[PDB]
Amino acid sequence: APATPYQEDIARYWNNEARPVNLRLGDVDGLYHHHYGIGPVDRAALGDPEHSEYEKKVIAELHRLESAQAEFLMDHLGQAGPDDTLVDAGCGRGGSMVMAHRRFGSRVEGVTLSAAQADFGNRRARELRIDDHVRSRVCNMLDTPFDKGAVTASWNNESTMYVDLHDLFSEHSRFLKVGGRYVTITGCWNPRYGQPSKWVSQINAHFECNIHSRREYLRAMADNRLVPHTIVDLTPDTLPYWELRATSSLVTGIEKAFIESYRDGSFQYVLIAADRV
Template sequence: MTTETTSIPTATAKIPAPATPYQEDIARYWNNEARPVNLRLGDVDGLYHHHYGIGAVDHAALGDPAHSEYEKKVVAELHRLESAQAEFLMDHLGPVGPGDTLVDAGCGRGGSMVMAHRRFGCRVEGVTLSTGQADFGNGRARELRIDDHVRSRVCNMLDTPFDKGSVTASWNNESTMYVDLHDLFGEHSRFLKVGGRYVTITGCWNPRYGQPSKWVSQINAHFECNIHSRREYLRAMADNRLVPHTIVDLTPDTLPYWELRATSSLVTGIEEAFIESYRDGSFQYVLIAADRV
């Protein structure tokens, strides 16, 4: 097996079939997804994300809401917060050199992969169930002339083609809610080097609340996913030789992003569920970094 990038377009390469009907549903969902909240934000600087933002809103940069350029500034600010989230994740990947390989499991349209390559100069492999996302990400890599280092491929993140112990660091950025955590962390543990780093940023329901709240249930229905509890993450990591050493509660840091997004023209109807669940403590936004032992 080789992880070298080829010039074969995703559409003409052999695409593995989804392993289950649910995976087929998820592939369909993301193949058809073209929300302005993802595409318009990516148009700001060519980095197309599929995750949320963290950090304080720069209200001075937004200016007067009555100004004709205000909505454009809101879009740029939301995008800045999303890129800040990706940078924060990469801050926790540990030492990475140009000769290393990183894996983005659930890579979306590839914005974080581009950022990782620019930051570390290394090879970045992304996996997604969506042919549309992979084609988009590979197209952007070719446009940026980094397709020799950055590649998206269509495959199951629970059954990747990467060699055992071949990857320096890997991550899931808001993509763990689509899979069984034990299966997922078992696969990361397989392809990570001993001493390699795994990082996830994810929303999880708070066990102290008792059960998933009505808001969490709405989020599950909206995205056709299954949000896990924080406790489940830690248990599944421990069972798969991934030892958490850093846990950061980002809930207070992501709330400003959602409050700003709720005022924009890019609303999707799920904003209230995120805001209320973060406020009542039933839902948390966390970073977990773990080392492979």
């Protein structure tokens, strides 16, 4: 049962979603992501733009940048081991969960509003024989079954724009143990610009999301016992990904809005890593 008419919309969006730009990239190595990439493009791997196999090399390179984004996130989760539980809030098809389990060996619990995504991720976990440690469930990340203080580290990778931040960080704060770690990577509108620009609103309209101001992230964390130890503006680092994507046959139409808004300073891609204290 959906929490709100809006979360019903979001369950529906993601139950229906199945774009080539996500699935073809995932097929590269069975890590299915729904987030963007960071880091320099590997021009040597790409080769000659005129070559017959170029679109496939671009696919492989975009995927590499998306996986690199997740590795950067996990660099900030502190240490974690097989006895620990990690929570992926808004877990998509579960690519980040597989990566986390591989890296840390932890139990990894994911929650998503999409039954299709949860099924897909659990089928993937079974194929990899890691289903005894990695599990996706259909659940509102604002209201989860995890016990108070049970969780060692958790994160939101491009999923914070679908929820009230105070309610979100309240919940992470509840299930994270004292000394626990939280990380988000998000696109937020830059309070320096003043208000959400037209580009930001176009992005909101495209995904049915609600991009928050960087000011709102910091405030919501301060009000919920999450204290940032690292904040990185990844805007420069994600532009190469988007500029390459823009040349791809798998474009979705929103590429210009991300590029222009990143360039004019109205929109930014940030990582915030915080301690639960």
